[PDB]
Amino acid sequence: FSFICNYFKLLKRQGPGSPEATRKAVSFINELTDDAKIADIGCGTGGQTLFLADYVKGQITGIDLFPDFIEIFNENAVKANCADRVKGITGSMDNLPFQNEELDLIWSEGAIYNIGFERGMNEWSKYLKKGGFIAVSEASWFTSERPAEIEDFWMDAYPEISVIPTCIDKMERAGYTPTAHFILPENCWTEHYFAPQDEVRETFMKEHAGNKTAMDFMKGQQYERSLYSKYKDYYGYVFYIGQKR
Numbered sequence: 610f611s612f613i614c615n616y617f618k619l620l621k622r623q624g625p626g627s628p629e630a631t632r633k634a635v636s637f638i639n640e641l642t643d644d645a646k647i648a649d650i651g652c653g654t655g656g657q658t659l660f661l662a663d664y665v666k667g668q669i670t671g672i673d674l675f676p677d678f679i680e681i682f683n684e685n686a687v688k689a690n691c692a693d694r695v696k697g698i699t700g701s702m703d704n705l706p707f708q709n710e711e712l713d714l715i716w717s718e719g720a721i722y723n724i725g726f727e728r729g730m731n732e733w734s735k736y737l738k739k740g741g742f743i744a745v746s747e748a749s750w751f752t753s754e755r756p757a758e759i760e761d762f763w764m765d766a767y768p769e770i771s772v773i774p775t776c777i778d779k780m781e782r783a784g785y786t787p788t789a790h791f792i793l794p795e796n797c798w799t800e801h802y803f804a805p806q807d808e809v810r811e812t813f814m815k816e817h818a819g820n821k822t823a824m825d826f827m828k829g830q831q832y833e834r835s836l837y838s839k840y841k842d843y844y845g846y847v848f849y850i851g852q853k854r
Contacts, residue, residue: 613826614675620805622656624720625797625846626746631660637789637850638714638742641667645713648672650702650733653720655682661716662695671697672705673721702729707736717745719846725769726776730783737853743785744850746793749773755843762836763844776849785851793846803834
């Protein structure tokens with residue numbers, strides 16, 4: 610749980626996605642002013658955060674469990690002349706540091722740990738203002754049944770994975786207007802998630818030859834890719850955008 614996160618500090622992103630993907634998500638929320646308070650829960654290194662900051666106005670707060678990630682986050686915000694509005698702090702997903710009706714937007718791209726789609730939608734809602742938006746990319750099914758292999762893997766990493774209708778149904782239950790939903794372009798995995806893991810893949814080996822667990826980790830990593838190229842028609846990330854009623 611430690612060493613994992615340490616290897617990810619090297620990548621510019623800890624999960625599928627893309628500028629365009631984060632951009633098409635914002636195209637469904639209402640314009641915000643510099644006064645708007647925004648929150649990216651599970652921001653990680655802030656890869657998507659800066660993409661977001663580029664398309665909206667307001668003050669953004671990044672929140673992640675892993676401090677090393679936040680350390681880089683603020684460093685990236687500074688290197689990007691915007692650490693005045695975009696700030697990062699450690700905290701937990703199930704105990705957010707906010708107040709009722711304080712936020713205008715709740716962003717989260719399934720990065721760094723999780724607490725169940727259903728659970729998040731309800732708990733995070735009391736922080737969002739009325740008419741405020743919630744946008745989150747979540748792994749889901751694209752059909753009513755898939756082969757066993759992909760079925761099992763997911764049912765062992767994140768069992769609350771489900772068909773899109775259920776996700777959309779949980780939203781309305783949580784008090785959201787299902788504004789929009791859309792599947793992240795296949796490129797969000799290959800180019801923007803797997804590819805990056807390549808540069809490092811080489812020197813990672815030399816750097817971690819003998820280490821036994823380091824190797825089991827890689828196989829695990831190379832197992833997602835070979836799992837995606839094989840079943841990408843049965844699953845993937847889906848961006849959900851809903852307005853609090």
